Design an enzyme around this catalytic site. Structure first.
Site, PDB file in Angstrom:
ATOM      1  N   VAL A   1       0.282   4.256  -2.525  1.00 57.57           N
ATOM      2  CA  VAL A   1      -0.048   5.558  -2.247  1.00 57.57           C
ATOM      3  C   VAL A   1       0.798   6.430  -3.043  1.00 57.57           C
ATOM      4  O   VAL A   1       0.375   7.616  -3.670  1.00 57.57           O
ATOM      5  CB  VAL A   1      -0.150   5.729  -0.649  1.00 57.57           C
ATOM      6  CG1 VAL A   1      -0.553   7.033  -0.293  1.00 57.57           C
ATOM      7  CG2 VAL A   1      -1.184   4.799  -0.088  1.00 57.57           C
TER       8      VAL A   1
ATOM      9  N   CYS B   1       0.912  -1.230  -0.077  1.00 57.98           N
ATOM     10  CA  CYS B   1      -0.126   0.101   0.087  1.00 57.98           C
ATOM     11  C   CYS B   1       0.692   1.254  -0.124  1.00 57.98           C
ATOM     12  O   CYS B   1       0.708   2.222  -0.815  1.00 57.98           O
ATOM     13  CB  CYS B   1      -1.011   0.124   1.146  1.00 57.98           C
ATOM     14  SG  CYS B   1      -0.423  -0.908   2.505  1.00 57.98           S
TER      15      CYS B   1
HETATM   16  S1  CLF Z   1       5.316  -3.021   6.833  1.00 54.95           S
HETATM   17 FE1  CLF Z   1       3.465  -3.639   8.436  1.00 54.95          FE
HETATM   18  S2  CLF Z   1       2.496  -5.331   7.472  1.00 54.95           S
HETATM   19 FE2  CLF Z   1       3.423  -4.078   5.604  1.00 54.95          FE
HETATM   20  S3  CLF Z   1       1.782  -2.415   4.867  1.00 54.95           S
HETATM   21 FE3  CLF Z   1       3.384  -1.506   6.567  1.00 54.95          FE
HETATM   22  S4  CLF Z   1       2.207  -1.733   8.835  1.00 54.95           S
HETATM   23 FE4  CLF Z   1       1.408  -3.241   7.035  1.00 54.95          FE
HETATM   24 FE5  CLF Z   1      -0.702  -4.627   5.420  1.00 54.95          FE
HETATM   25  S5  CLF Z   1      -2.468  -4.469   3.710  1.00 54.95           S
HETATM   26 FE6  CLF Z   1      -0.935  -6.109   3.108  1.00 54.95          FE
HETATM   27  S6  CLF Z   1       0.505  -6.486   4.878  1.00 54.95           S
HETATM   28 FE7  CLF Z   1       1.185  -4.579   3.809  1.00 54.95          FE
HETATM   29  S7  CLF Z   1       0.362  -4.881   1.797  1.00 54.95           S
HETATM   30 FE8  CLF Z   1      -0.660  -3.414   3.084  1.00 54.95          FE
END
Ligand code: CLF
Ligand code: CFM
Ligand SMILES: [Ca+2]
Ligand SMILES: [Ca+2]
Lengths: 522, 478, 522
Positions: A156, A152
């Site tokens: 973004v 994401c």
């Molecule tokens: S490093 Fe950690 S797990 Fe990654 S996004 Fe960032 S806070 Fe979350 Fe979330 S929904 Fe899936 S796992 Fe991401 S691609 Fe987005």
């Protein structure tokens, strides 16, 4: 304490009096937890229609979802290609999660990399991460191909994967001819299956788009097969078995069956067999393309029909009798290969199993969830067995899919009391199994908590879970099972029938009381 | 063996790395030498992980929701952002608890705002508010909420602080806004620091003016023990047995109440340095509550700690401490008596988070095993200083070890047993090396304290001497 | 009463108050049953070592045996040959029983005939029954071959099967060249497996003995395979799979896999594919003969070595890692076919499954029963997994076999607390699971009553049954499973591990109380 000769782990351990007493004091002393009465009350409340209604009125809160973000699918899709290394451009946190999520379901290693974007990489846009990341990746893990997906974060900030990759090559970070297909996989759009779709379509574009000139439909005399997000080794194998059993020239695009089942012989094979790049480059030359799971291969369908000019058959996931028949017949028609007596007999046997078990099956009401195709198919098979899929839930489902299933249900008396639920999480389902209690529920490991909840109301309220789907973390090796074709059908049938009989034996195990019905033969 | 053979190993592995990556990695691989207390000994930590080298690190979100905030029972934690983080994280960590999941305790559950495209483009700040209301309605018994920021939240700049403050004031509920965006930082480490600060600002201060809590001269608090598989409980029982009163456990079988009570404890017992040292220091400089570190991995370490802890109190406590040590003596003694012979001299290599890689060493030596190498994912030089006095001279040390590295290292070292995470397990099992998960105890009971030691011992033997290992090579091959 | 919309069958029905009350009155009014106290008392008594001792002192009474009479085996053996009709010379009652016994285990039709000997047929000796019976049988069911077995009745009265058959032919009741192999199968000697042995040996004699002149070992370049009493369709199929996978010329003697799995397609095939008579006549020309289940093929072994001059390898039933390796290697040596990478990988995968599940398996104590070979093998595999087969019971076992297993146990630390029991029935085992309680028990459907008994003592005393063996009547289609080879090993392993996890989930399903250990991932 502990008795060296018979050591007690967490479970029997914390049941010892000194431990119990400690927890009691802890609770009463500093936890300030709500009185057991209030707890019991609110619980009984969560099982009422009144609660369920408020539960369904939710417009923001999602509790216990039945899906995952796109990148997960992109990765699985990536793993299906020969010596390919999944590369997720974005935060490293995701990759760690993806790997482990799959690690637990397959009980196998899961190779995937991230170019580890951080604070300043997000602000300044991580083009360097792409450059160094790709160079480092190739040099260290020596993959033949790198499949780029996204987080994401990268979605973004609009990180132009293509621009980055192009510049990565032009600036000498990796050989210009090194296969680096990419795909934008916004976590916040669709779900993991969409990720699989996007990733595949991107790869298909990469080895095709430009080279479309020399391509001619049917020239290779093969039938392309796209599995889609599949987490059962047996599901890939059964399709390949049947195809070879018919003598049908085929090409399974994205085949990670090997990677997800490396033999433990003192050697670690990071990469394993998969779809060769040549198979992908030659794919347009195929007679046609069959999408095993059409409902989440939408983008790929458009690319195949549009660019490859393949007249993709409107076939449902080959699940259950009818759909497997249709699949075989269609393949038969496209390849000109007659369905061998081998398969004909196999179909007959499944029917035989159905006839032998129809007695116990007929009437059993089920609740279920999972990916669109899987669910849709599971429903059809359930109907064929004479069972009733009362609560059909598919969190990542869409309006059109709901209609499709509804039509399928309207085609059978058994679907009469069924209700399809899209965009609904397991907490919603929890209410459904409480208010309109079914016999069993078919789903992934996440449902074990629903069964826990149900039993807590009472034994007669307990709705046993039948583990079929993804992910299955609390049961070893179920990922080897099959759900597709007559083989998968037979397994599912057996599993269901036996699940029924099990619960019955339990219910009738009470000596003097209910054991009178504890039959030796059933 | 021998730092020369080791240094050669390090230098050999580094060869595949393109100059840039090679330069950086060398700074994170070092040969241990006790007495050395710093980074001088070619060891730098807590830095940006090299892109593409497949590291085993996580994200700030994992640091907050994953390890610190998630464990709290009677509190609802919202994985704010797209689905995924919450899902992949749902019931992964074995931070055990006691509660009616769904009504008063919510750990097992995955509450998320399931961000969809329109929520990004327009900012799901309104969605959050509406979400909270839905939570209060559907989960009346929650004693608080916490929003765990996923990457998106940090970028789009959603004023989650305000949503929390406004809704909190209205509903009269503690709503804690945590800025643990995955991209922020370099690992789960910063996530800890952030989570700690969040606690400090939104939870701890709540009971400062309140004096109703009846304190005692033996009121202690266990901080940095996440009760993995029951770890905290097995540790708590010992402490209380020697007359202490564990007012609160930080992120174990923890409730918001006991967390708020913590500022009334006479002493803070820090187990996991890397994750709680932050708040520990704050509690000291503010409430004047002293804090000390300790270890419960293995009898020697446990006993050492038990005494050092009792030493901070009067004689009744110290006297009891001895009774406790005496009581459990025949037990752990019987344990080593049975298992040590089976594990005597067996070499072990490790790699874990930011504590265990050094803390479990004691326990290993108690069973006669030798840790030939160890490393952390996110530990800072703080930990590395402490690590050096634990590792035997010339043992291998590594920070944020790349997948490739661990493989090659293991190839030459040829340990009899390896202890690391889930992403590692099957890789080494394939190689025929007995592996044991040191994060999730490989789904086994507690390892902390004496009771946990017996389990730890059994597990090591169970795997290390399992017949499956002899059968790796098929007879028709040599 | 009954609610038309939701009809209640025997189980929920007799739980209705009016029904309960009726039974209470019936009991108190005319049953004169022992007081609930006395019942509870005697029960607790049956679980003590004191009881168990008296239980083991039995010299006449057999309670809940774990075997069946010879003829049953003879029949199954008969069903393995092409268009062959099992014919049991004796009382018709037996045949009805045999058929049904198999009907319930395979959930398939079971064709078998009896020449229906009655009072005067026993007194006067049923030679006519043989004559008419054979003529009638051929004419009506048109079989190509008739395999004669016997009933204790015919065995006591010394009915000379051979004389009868010879005279049946000479007197024109059936064509002189019509294949009518026979075998004496006294119910009161050995067991069903012995019947299988005798029946096979008789058939082997029939198509060989005289024609031994033109036979030359190895001339046909095939390896004879004798399955023996096998009731798992998968067990026949796996052997044939592996052999074909290696490209080994083989000949499975007595192959009823087809007969026991006829497809339900509106047509009834009384007979199905099986071992062709030619394969039997040509059998001596084979390179050698491998007995999959040597312990009950004793008579056949002597005939093969003695008459066929085949140097039968001393191989154990191909169960579990080691034994499957040995089997493959031996076959490899005899046929000169190198073990394909196909099988090598499969072995590696099983090892991988073992390594992934060794954690939960290691230490689990089991109780088990069944035929000699099956048990012996199950034990070996259990040991390989790091489990402890504490109670090894084989009713139809012998002194030498016990020794063999004992030696196997003495070869591993895990066999340390194991104890082999021959000539012991399930009632004996019932005591063993009470006194020295194991974790689970592996066996046939008959054990479900032992689990009923155990649970009745208390939940923590309940010893769950894992259905593996014969017969399995209370579970649909388990007869399709496999126990032999790596494939069978994998299935068994999976089954065991999952059984463990199941019981754990149950034990930890108690919300607030034990659900703290209810892990999503295991
Ligand atoms: S490093 Fe950690 S797990 Fe990654 S996004 Fe960032 S806070 Fe979350 Fe979330 S929904 Fe899936 S796992 Fe991401 S691609 Fe987005
Ligand atoms: S990898 Fe602990 S600094 Fe942290 S989840 Fe494990 S070695 Fe964490 S001891 Fe702990 S309970 Fe941990 S095992 Fe510090 S909390 S971010 Mo992975
Ligand atoms: Ca594995
Ligand atoms: Ca049938």
């Amino acid at each position: 304490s502990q008795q060296v000769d018979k050591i007690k782990a967490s479970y029997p351990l914390f049941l010892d009096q000194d431990y119990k007493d400690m927890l009691a004091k802890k609770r009463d002393g500093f936890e300030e937890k709500y009185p057991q009465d209030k707890i019991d009350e609110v619980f009984q409340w969560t099982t009422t229609k009144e609660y369920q209604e408020l539960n369904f009125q939710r417009e923001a809160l999602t509790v216990n979802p039945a899906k995952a973000c796109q990148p997960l699918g992109a990765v699985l899709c990536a793993l299906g290609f020969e010596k390919t290394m999944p590369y997720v451009h974005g935060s490293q946190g995701c990759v760690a999660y993806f790997r482990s999520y799959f690690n637990r379901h397959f009980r196998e290693p899961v190779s995937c990399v991230s170019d580890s974007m951080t604070e300043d990489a997000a602000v300044f846009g991580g083009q360097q991460n792409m450059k160094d990341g790709l160079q480092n990746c190739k040099a260290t893990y020596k993959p033949d191909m790198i499949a780029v997906s996204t987080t994401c974060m990268a979605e973004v900030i609009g990180d132009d994967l293509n621009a980055f990759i192009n510049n990565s090559k032009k600036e000498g970070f990796i050989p210009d001819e090194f296969p680096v297909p990419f795909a934008h996989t916004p976590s916040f759009v669709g779900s993991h299956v969409t990720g699989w779709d996007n990733m595949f379509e991107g790869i298909a574009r990469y080895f095709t788009l430009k080279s479309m000139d020399d391509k001619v439909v049917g020239s290779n005399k093969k039938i392309n097969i796209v599995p889609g997000f599949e987490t059962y080794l047996g599901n890939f194998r059964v399709i390949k078995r049947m195809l070879s059993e018919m003598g049908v020239g085929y090409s399974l695009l994205s085949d990670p069956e090997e990677v997800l089942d490396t033999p433990a012989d003192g050697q670690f094979r990071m990469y394993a067999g998969g779809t060769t790049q040549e198979e992908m480059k030659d794919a347009p030359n195929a007679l046609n393309t069959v999408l095993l799971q059409p409902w989440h291969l939408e983008k790929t369908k458009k690319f195949v029909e549009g660019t490859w000019k393949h007249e993709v058959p409107k076939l449902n996931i080959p699940m259950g009798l009818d759909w497997t028949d249709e699949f075989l017949m269609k393949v038969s028609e496209i390849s000109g290969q007659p369905i061998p007596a081998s398969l004909t007999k196999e179909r007959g046997r499944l029917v035989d199993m159905m006839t032998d078990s129809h007695t116990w099956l007929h009437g059993k009401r089920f609740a279920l969830w999972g990916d669109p195709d899987f669910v849709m198919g599971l429903v059809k098979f359930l109907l064929e067995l004479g069972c009733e899929p009362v609560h059909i839930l598919c969190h990542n489902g869409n309006k059109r899919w709901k209609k499709a299933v509804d039509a399928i249900l309207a085609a059978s008396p058994y679907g009469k009391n069924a209700t399809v639920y899209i965009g609904k999480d397991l907490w919603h389902l929890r209410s459904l199994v409480f208010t309109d209690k079914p016999d069993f529920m078919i789903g992934n490991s996440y449902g074990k908590f629903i069964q826990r909840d149900t039993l807590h109301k009472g034994k007669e309220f307990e709705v046993p879970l039948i583990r079929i789907g993804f992910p299955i973390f609390d049961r070893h090796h179920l990922h080897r099972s099959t759900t597709l074709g007559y083989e998968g059908a037979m397994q599912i049938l057996t599993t269901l029938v036996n699940s029924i009989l099990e619960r019955l034996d339990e219910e009738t195990r009470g000596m003097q009381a209910t054991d009178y019905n504890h039959d030796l033969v059933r | 063996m021998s730092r020369e053979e080791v240094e050669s190993l390090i230098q050999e592995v580094l060869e595949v790395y393109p100059e840039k990556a090679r330069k950086d990695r060398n700074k994170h691989l070092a040969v241990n030498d006790p007495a050395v207390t710093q980074s001088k000994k070619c060891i730098i930590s807590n830095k940006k992980s090299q892109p593409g080298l497949m590291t085993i690190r996580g994200c700030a979100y994992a640091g907050s929701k994953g390890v610190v905030w998630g464990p709290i029972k009677d509190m609802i934690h919202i994985s704010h952002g797209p689905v995924g983080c919450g899902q992949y994280s749902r019931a992964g960590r074995r931070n055990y608890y006691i509660g009616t999941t769904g009504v008063n305790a919510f750990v097992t559950m995955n509450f998320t705002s399931d961000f969809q495209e329109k929520d990004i483009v327009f900012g799901g700040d309104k969605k959050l508010a509406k979400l909270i209301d839905e939570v209060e309605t559907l989960f009346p018994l929650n004693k608080g909420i916490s929003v765990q920021s996923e990457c998106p939240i940090g970028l789009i700049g959603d004023d989650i602080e305000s949503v929390s403050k406004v809704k909190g004031a209205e509903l009269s509920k503690t709503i804690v806004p945590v800025r643990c965006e995955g991209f922020r930082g370099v690992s789960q480490s910063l996530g800890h620091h952030i989570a700690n600060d969040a606690v400090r600002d939104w939870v701890l201060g709540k009971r400062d003016e309140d004096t109703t809590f009846a304190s005692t001269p033996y009121d202690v608090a266990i901080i940095g023990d996440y009760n993995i598989g029951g770890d905290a409980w097995s540790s708590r029982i010992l402490l209380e047995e020697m007359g202490l009163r564990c007012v609160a456990q930080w992120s174990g079988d923890g409730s918001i109440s006991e967390i708020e009570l913590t500022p009334k404890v006479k002493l803070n017992l820090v187990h996991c340095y890397r994750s709680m040292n932050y708040i520990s220091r704050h509690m000291e400089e503010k409430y004047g509550i002293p804090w000390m570190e300790y270890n419960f991995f293995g009898p020697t370490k446990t006993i050492e700690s038990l005494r050092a802890i009792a030493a901070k109190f009067d004689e009744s406590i110290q006297k009891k401490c001895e009774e406790v040590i005496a009581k459990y003596k025949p037990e752990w003694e019987a344990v080593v008596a049975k298992y040590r012979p089976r594990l005597e001299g067996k070499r072990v290599m490790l790699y874990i988070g930011g504590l265990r890689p050094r803390h479990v060493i004691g326990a290993y030596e108690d069973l006669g095993m030798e840790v030939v190498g160890t490393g952390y994912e996110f530990a800072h030089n703080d930990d590395y200083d402490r690590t050096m006095k634990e590792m035997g001279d010339s043992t291998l040390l590594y920070d944020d070890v790349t997948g490739y590295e661990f493989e090659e290292f293991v190839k030459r070292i040829k340990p009899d047993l390896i202890g690391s995470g889930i992403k590692e397990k099957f890789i080494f099992q394939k190689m025929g090396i007995p592996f044991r998960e040191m994060h999730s105890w490989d789904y086994s009971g507690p390892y902390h304290g004496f009771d946990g030691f017996a389990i730890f011992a059994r597990d090591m033997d169970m795997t290390l001497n399992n017949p499956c290992w002899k059968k790796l090579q098929a007879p028709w091959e040599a």
